[PDB]
Design a protein around this ligand. Structure first.
Ligand SMILES: [Cl-]
Ligand SMILES: [Cl-]
Ligand code: NA
Ligand SMILES: [Tb+3]
Ligand SMILES: [Tb+3]
Length: 129
């Protein structure tokens, strides 16, 4: 599923991401925009053989099991395919674990390079929230 901007903002708010670990909602919408272009089915293969999955491009080396990432951990206790669902619950719950790791949202390269330090509130302006 390809989310609309405000549709995704409302779903993330319902699942408790607004101000989670201090990151306002616009940070999460901005991250999803540049990680996946709002597409729950996005996948991207990395040079180390791991793959990034879903709207927040969660990585199979640490967070989910895809059966082909040797020596990988499954810290979110989910098959990576669950992160491609039109229902974002699994992605949100796993993202909450990731952002609680030491580096916060710096774990997402696109957030660090394209959202951090910008007017991220613009990503939710005009939305009925
Ligand atoms: Cl915001
Ligand atoms: Cl933080
Ligand atoms: Na794994
Ligand atoms: Tb530690
Ligand atoms: Tb440690």
């Amino acid at each position: 599923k390809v989310f609309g901007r405000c549709e995704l903002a409302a779903a993330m708010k319902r699942h408790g991401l607004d101000n989670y670990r201090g990151y306002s909602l616009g940070n999460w919408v901005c991250a999803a925009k540049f990680e996946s272009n709002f597409n729950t089915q996005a996948t991207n293969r990395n040079t180390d053989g791991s793959t990034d999955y879903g709207i927040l491009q969660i990585n199979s080396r640490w967070w989910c099991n895809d059966g082909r990432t040797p020596g990988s951990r499954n810290l979110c206790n989910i098959p990576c395919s669950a992160l491609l669902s039109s229902d974002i619950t699994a992605s949100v719950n796993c993202a909450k674990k990731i952002v609680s790791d030491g580096n916060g949202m710096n774990a997402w390269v696109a957030w660090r390079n394209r959202c951090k330090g910008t007017d991220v509130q613009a990503w939710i302006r005009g939305c009925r929230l």
